[PDB]
Amino acid sequence: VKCTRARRLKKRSLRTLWINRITAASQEHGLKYPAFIINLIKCQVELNRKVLADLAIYEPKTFKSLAALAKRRREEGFAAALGDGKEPDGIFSRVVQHR
Amino acid sequence: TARGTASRFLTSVLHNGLGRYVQQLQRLSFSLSRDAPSSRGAREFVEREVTDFARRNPGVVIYVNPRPCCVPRVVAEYLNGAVREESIHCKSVEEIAALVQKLADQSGLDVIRIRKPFHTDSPSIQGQWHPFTNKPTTLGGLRPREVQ
Amino acid sequence: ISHGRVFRRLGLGPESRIHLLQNLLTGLVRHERIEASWARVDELRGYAEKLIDYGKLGDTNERAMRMADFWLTEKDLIPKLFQVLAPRFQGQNGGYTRMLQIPNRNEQDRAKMAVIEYKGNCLPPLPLPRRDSNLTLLNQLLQGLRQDQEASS
Amino acid sequence: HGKSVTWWDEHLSEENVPFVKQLVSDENKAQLASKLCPLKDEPWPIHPWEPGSSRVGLIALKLGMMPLWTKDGQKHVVTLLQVQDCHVLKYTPKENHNGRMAALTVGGKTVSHFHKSASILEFYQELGLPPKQKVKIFNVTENAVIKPGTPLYAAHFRPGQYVDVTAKTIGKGFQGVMRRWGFKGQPATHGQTKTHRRPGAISTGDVARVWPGTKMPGQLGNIDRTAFGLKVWRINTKHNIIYVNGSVPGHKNCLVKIKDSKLPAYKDFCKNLPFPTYFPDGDEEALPEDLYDENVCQPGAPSITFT
Amino acid sequence: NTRHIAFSGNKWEQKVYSSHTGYPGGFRQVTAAQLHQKDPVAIVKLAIYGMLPKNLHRRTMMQRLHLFPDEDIPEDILKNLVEELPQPRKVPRRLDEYTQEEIEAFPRVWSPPEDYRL
Amino acid sequence: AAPKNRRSIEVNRCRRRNPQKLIKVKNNIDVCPECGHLKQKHILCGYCYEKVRKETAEIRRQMGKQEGGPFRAPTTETVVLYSGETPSEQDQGKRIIERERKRPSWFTQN
RNA sequence: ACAAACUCCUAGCCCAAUACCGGACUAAUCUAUUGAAACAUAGAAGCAAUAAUGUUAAUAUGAGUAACAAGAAGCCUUUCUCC
RNA sequence: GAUGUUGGAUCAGGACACCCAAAUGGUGCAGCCGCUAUUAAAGGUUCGUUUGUUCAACGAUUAAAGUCCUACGUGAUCUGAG
RNA sequence: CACAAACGCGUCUCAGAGAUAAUUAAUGAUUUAAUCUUAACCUAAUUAACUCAUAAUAAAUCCAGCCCUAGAACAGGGCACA
Ligand SMILES: [Mg+2]
Ligand SMILES: [Mg+2]
Ligand SMILES: [Mg+2]
Ligand SMILES: [Mg+2]
Ligand SMILES: [Mg+2]
Ligand SMILES: [Mg+2]
Ligand SMILES: [Mg+2]
Ligand SMILES: [Mg+2]
Ligand SMILES: [Mg+2]
Ligand SMILES: [Mg+2]
Ligand SMILES: [Mg+2]
Ligand SMILES: [Mg+2]
Ligand SMILES: [Mg+2]
Ligand SMILES: [Mg+2]
Ligand SMILES: [Mg+2]
Ligand SMILES: [Mg+2]
Ligand SMILES: [Mg+2]
Ligand SMILES: [Mg+2]
Ligand SMILES: [Mg+2]
Ligand SMILES: [Mg+2]
Ligand SMILES: [Mg+2]
Ligand SMILES: [Mg+2]
Ligand SMILES: [Mg+2]
Ligand SMILES: [Mg+2]
Ligand SMILES: [Mg+2]
Ligand SMILES: [Mg+2]
Ligand SMILES: [Mg+2]
Ligand SMILES: [Mg+2]
Ligand SMILES: [Mg+2]
Ligand SMILES: [Mg+2]
Ligand SMILES: [Mg+2]
Ligand SMILES: [Mg+2]
Ligand SMILES: [Mg+2]
Ligand SMILES: [Mg+2]
Ligand SMILES: [Mg+2]
Ligand SMILES: [Mg+2]
Ligand SMILES: [Zn+2]
């Protein structure tokens, strides 16, 4: 029994482990977790938290680039909301569509 | 149960499938009775299907013996040196067929908890994280409070 | 608490332990060597030793006499006390007695057993322990220190 | 390797035995009479009396108890304490021990080499004294420090003073809760069954455990305690014998640790006492057979008449 | 620099640290101020201790934690220091820190009456 | 009081396999200079004490033969003789015990 | 931001339950034919035990715990010491 | 398919709503007594005659002879008079 | 007190500094008087607690045996004088 309830828990556990990893590397770049994740999404990059965390362990370069991306987009968002006008689209603020 | 059994990481036999894929199944030995009902399905399979299956797969040898046996059996053996036992006992033709095809596509590796889904050699291209990696160095490589 | 108690408590009580020692002393004085329970013997040793200093008080002394009367059960034994035991002890003040420990009794109860004796009894010598001889490498190594303590004085 | 049990006396012949004994005792007399003369050897710096000072203590041997009288007519009992061999052993500087006061190690009466341990006999052969029974540590201010390997005497304490006495108290062993504590019993006669001594209920219903404090039958008396406020009356210079006041904890003939009272009232009493310590060599005078306090009826005397 | 802890609010006064000997009436309530007075290290150690998960490894990670009242460190522990951490709060300067440049730079808000005495 | 739960074989092991409960090795064991048997250092040799005991017994019998009563005990010191021996002047005037065996190795003449 | 059995996703054998109720299977026996190294169709039943202070047998635990005995020395059946 | 119940005996743990000792404020406090309020629980808080009694009355005292909680504390420690 | 002991009915001995609570006070602003201040600065005077000075303890490994004021067992102290 405990085996089964555990089978369902296991996925939570993993996700938490992950999230903390992501958090850690994000911190190493001076960026908190939530900011990182969302502002990574807003760039139309769907990445799993699994693959995220492994990009933080085995791909420090790629990852640092990712956090830079999200950082870029975030500040671009601060200026987007503070600017109070419709004309500017940050170069990364643009919303692409599929073809 | 997990803590009950052994485990194995996910692996290839002899790095199969990399250079060229090689069907890992070596031989099959069917044992059935021409007479007994228990072997009924496995008789029909021997009639119709075996022939063609053999043509399907050159790499595997098939030894088929009618003998006075009461429990129809097929024994896979693998290049891995591994052997697997099976009963074809009281099954349809469809059934048998599906099972032999199961044996056909296996590693020969043992069915045990497989710790993680991905076997990767050197995952670490472009680097593998170490503590310092994101830390800026200072001039002279001095400590926090060290003076010169 | 037992602090500074000089007697072990044996037998049915005080008086009992005394009559116990009576027998032990009787036997000692008749047979001159006896084996018995270690505690009982160790205990007895004091009594055995002082009885001989009563014997040394001569056949005439009254105190000494009724003393030996009480302490020797077979009356036959009272002469052997004064005439035999006491005179063959003169030079030695307290050295009357040898008490040694024997291997534990081979009965199932396995007590701790000793043997007690009057020196200069006529009996086979108890196989006492000997010191190592003076030919031993160690003692020999000490004789050098000895002779060079003589040679510098 | 089945290596056997060995004591010293084992393989010695009848001949070498008394030789060993004499050899040792002799080197003892030599060893003690050698450091019998402290002041000419290499006496450490003697320092003046500072007000917050703390003097070294002593190790004694509890002799007996004896009555003694005051000029006023009241009666006392006093302790006969005898220094036998008191020689300071080692010295720990201030910062290597308490970070406050430096510590002075002190030895007790002399015993057989044969029965002690290698490490120790090595330590003593690097000093050059015979082996001591009891070894204690006195806390001391750096101006009291002596040279280690140095003798000590009973003139260390002058008559009238208060001292402190620490010792292993008389062992009663495993004792009951009457004696260990002083619990009342249960009455004997009004029908009690198998109760007449037992500690009675040990606790409370709701706690459902017993408290870590709780007083219960057990080991009693062998342990270290210290009496304060003990006046000294009389010193015997020749036999090294202190008469202290009332009762000192421990059995007669046991080993003791004496010092000056660290009691508040007596704090500064050190200025008038022989301080580093007392020194037979240096004064080159003889102190009388006995030193009495001024309250004291002496063994020969007027035989008081009240007026 | 453990002795130099800052405590927001009056917390110095109302945060009490309790502990129990286990002996009846052996219970101890102590004002934070007192405690820190006695042992500088305590305050911080309890914060960090109470802040870890409650399993065994706390005891073990409690080992890797070194706490110094002032800056006095064995050159052992000085020698192996990798990196300095950013101070978690920006300390306010007293009046006397400010350069006269910045003192003058800040505008006089109100003009006092001359007659009034200060 | 009644035990609330059966104890485990583990717990039982750790109780009664405890080192304090174990039989310790006695290291004072030596060999007899005489018969090469074994004895603890502080104790007489059992075997040698046996030769002794036997001889003593026989002597006591032969001195129960020279005595004709439960109560009759000599007023003189006694000495024991063996095949081919004679009372010396020092030893004459004493009760004598004449025994069959030749004088043993360990026993001295005295 | 983080957070479920809800909902997506990739696959499916495609949706919780006490009393009562319906269904599909199957352990082991024997009988009829087959089977023959373990067997398959039917027919039958003393047809399946983690719980009845269950019955019998055997083993643990308390526990090597509680508890029980032989007067002394000697010459081995003589002396003592006691009731 | 039992959480054995009053009172005493032993040993007390706790509370403070303080009976003592301690530091004070107010008095229809001169002072001595007194009466009230505040703060404080480390330590103390008696021996008897009668009742099974807890209460209570009384004899004598004391710095006082505190109010309570603990399965109306405690019976695998006792006592059963109830 | 019929043991060399135990024992009370006998003898001996018992402590400084800090910190406060309720209260008193002094300088003094908000409010240029006054105001002990849930205003600063220093402050004073002030119960018990409770901390701390100080005292205990504090030499790693010989231990057969035999003594012991040490001890249920195990440990502990003795055994060179004499
Ligand atoms: Mg799921
Ligand atoms: Mg004794
Ligand atoms: Mg007995
Ligand atoms: Mg003795
Ligand atoms: Mg004792
Ligand atoms: Mg009584
Ligand atoms: Mg009784
Ligand atoms: Mg009864
Ligand atoms: Mg989720
Ligand atoms: Mg059935
Ligand atoms: Mg069963
Ligand atoms: Mg059931
Ligand atoms: Mg039952
Ligand atoms: Mg059952
Ligand atoms: Mg058993
Ligand atoms: Mg037994
Ligand atoms: Mg038991
Ligand atoms: Mg028993
Ligand atoms: Mg009997
Ligand atoms: Mg029940
Ligand atoms: Mg019950
Ligand atoms: Mg109480
Ligand atoms: Mg109050
Ligand atoms: Mg008052
Ligand atoms: Mg109270
Ligand atoms: Mg009524
Ligand atoms: Mg009433
Ligand atoms: Mg009443
Ligand atoms: Mg009740
Ligand atoms: Mg009751
Ligand atoms: Mg109970
Ligand atoms: Mg009744
Ligand atoms: Mg003003
Ligand atoms: Mg004013
Ligand atoms: Mg302290
Ligand atoms: Mg020892
Ligand atoms: Zn032998």
Residue C81, SS3? helix
Strand partners, B28: B62, B76
Phi, psi values for residue D264, rounded to 5° = -60, -45
Go through C35-54 and write b for each residue having 16 or more CB atoms within 10 A of its CB, e for each that does not: bbbbebbbbbbebbeebbeb
- Which of E81, E76, A28 shows the shortest CA–CA distance to B142? E81
Contact D80, D241 (CB under 8 A): yes
* CA–CA separation, C42 and C35 (whole Å): 11
User: According to the 3-state scheme, what is the secondary structure of D288-300?
Assistant: CCEEECCCECCCC
Asked if F52 and C76 come within 8 Å (Cβ–Cβ), the reply is: no
Give the integer Cα–Cα distance in Å for D166 and E107.
75
CA/C1' separation E116–I39 (Å): 22
Instruction: Quote the Cα angle for F53-F56-F60, to 5°.
Output: 135
Q: Is B145 helix (H, G, I), strand (E, B) or coil?
A: coil
What are the structure tokens assigned to B124, written together? Answer: 């670490």
- Cα D122 from Cα D149, distance rounded (Å): 15
D51: which strand partners? none
Long-range contacts of C83-89 (CB under 8 A, 24+ apart): C83/C59, C83/F75, C84/F75, C84/F76, C84/F77, C85/C29, C85/C52, C85/C55, C85/C118, C86/C52, C86/C55, C86/C56, C88/C120, C88/F77, C89/C52, C89/C55, C89/C56, C89/C120
Q: Is F15 helix (H, G, I), strand (E, B) or coil?
A: helix
Residue D119, phi then psi, degrees to nearest 5? -50, -45
Task: Give the number of other Cβ atoms within 10 Å of residue D43's Cβ.
Answer: 15
Pick from C52, C44, C51, C48: nearest CA to C10: C44
Tokens representing residue E23 in the block: 């002996």
Distance in Å, CA D227 to ligand 36 centroid: 28
d(CA C79, CA C68): 10
Q: Which residues of F touch D4 (CB under 8 A)?
A: 27-28, 30
CB B75 within 8 A of CB B83: yes
Report how far Cα F49 is from the mean position of its chain's Cα atoms. Answer: 3
d(CA E112, CA E106): 16
* Inter-chain CB proximity E21 and D212 less than 8 Å: yes
The set of strand G positions with any atom below 7 Å of a protein CB reads: 1-5, 34-41, 60-64, 69-76, 78-82
Sorted by sequence, the CB contacts under 8 Å of residue D20 that are 6+ apart come out as: C142, D8, D12
Is C16 domain-assigned? yes
For residues C44, C50, C51 and C54, what is the CA-based torsion angle, rounded to 10 degrees?
A: -170
DSSP assignment, residue F58? H
Count of beta carbons in the 10 Å neighbourhood of residue C74? 14
Are D168 and D223 in contact, with CB atoms under 8 Å apart? yes
For residue C18, being part of any structural domain is answered with yes
Instruction: Report if CB D26 to strand I is under 7 Å.
Output: no
CA of B58 to C1' of H28 (A): 127
Among candidate residues A21, A15, A55, A22, the one with its CA nearest the CA of residue A38: A22
- Reported as half-sphere exposure (CB side, CA atoms, 13 A), residue E76 has a value of 2
State how far the Cα of E100 lies from the Cα of D53, in Å rounded to an integer: 55
CA gyration radius, chain B: 26
Residue holding tokens 């199932």? C108
Place of tokens 């109760």: D195
Task: Quote the ligand 13 centre to F6 CA distance (angstroms).
Answer: 15
The answer to whether C139 contacts chain D (CB < 8 Å) is yes
E43: number of Cβ within 10 Å: 20
Residue C146 placed within a domain:
no
Q: Label the pairing between strands D241-245 and F29-31.
A: unpaired
| 3-class DSSP string for chain D | CCCCCCCCCCCCCCCHHHHHHHHHHHHHHHHHHHCCCCCCCCCCCCCCCCCCCCCCCEEEEEEEEEEEEECCCCEEEEEEEECCCCEEEEEECCCCCCCCCEEEEEECCECCCCCCCHHHHHHHHCCCCCCECCEEEEEECCCCCCCCCCECCHHHCCCCCEEEEEEECCCCEEECHHHHHCCCCCCCCCCCCCCCCCCCCCCCCCCCCCCCCCCCCEEECCCEEEEEEEEEEEEECCCCEEEEECCCCCCCCCEEEEEECCCCCCCCHHHHCCCCCCCHHHHCCCCCCEEECCCECCCCCCCCCCC
Q: In Å, what is the CA distance from C139 to each residue of B22, C129, D13?
A: 88, 17, 7
**Packed helices D16-34 and C137-150: angle between N→C axes, nearest 10 degrees:** 50
Structure tokens at C3: 């602090």
Beta bridge pairs of residue D218: D175
Domain count, chain C: 1
Are A60 and B126 a contacting pair at CB < 8 A? yes
- Report if residue C29 sits inside a domain: yes
Which residues contact residue D21 at a Cβ distance below 8 angstroms, ignoring those fewer than 6 apart?
none
How many other CB atoms sit within 10 Å of the CB of residue C85?
A: 22
CATH superfamily label, B1-148: Glutaredoxin (3.40.30.10)
Would you say residue C67 lies in a domain?
A: yes
Q: B38 φ, ψ to 5°? A: -60, -30
Please give the biggest Cα pair distance in chain A. Answer: 60
Residue C17 sits in a domain whose CATH number is 3.90.1030.10
Contacts of E26 in chain D (CB under 8 A): 213
CB C119, CB C97: distance < 8 Å? yes
Domain region containing C64: 10-121
Question: Within a 10 A sphere around the Cβ of C2, how many other Cβ atoms?
Answer: 8
3-state SS assignment for residue E24: coil
- The answer to the question of residue C53 being in a domain is yes
Q: Fill in the amino acid letter for D42.
A: E
- Confirm whether C58 is domain-assigned: yes
**Alpha carbon separation from C71 to C16, C52, C74, D125, E11 (Å, rounded):** 14, 11, 9, 55, 89
Find the ligand nearest to C11 CA. Answer: 3
Chain D residue numbers touching E23 (CB-CB < 8 A): 211-213
d(CA D15, CA D33): 28
- Alpha-carbon distance values, F22 to D217, F14, F16 (Å): 29, 12, 8
Strands B61-66 and B113-114: unpaired
Report yes or no: E43 and E36 within 8 Å, Cβ to Cβ.
yes
B20 C-beta neighbours (distance < 10 Å), count: 6
Option in D11, D20, D172 nearest C136 (CB): D11
Taking the alpha carbons at both ends of chain B, their separation in whole angstroms is: 62
Q: How far apart are CA D63 and CA B26, in angstroms?
A: 101
At C74, the amino acid letter reads E
Contact F106 C123 (CB under 8 A): no
Domains and CATH numbers, chain E: 1-118 (3.90.1180.10)
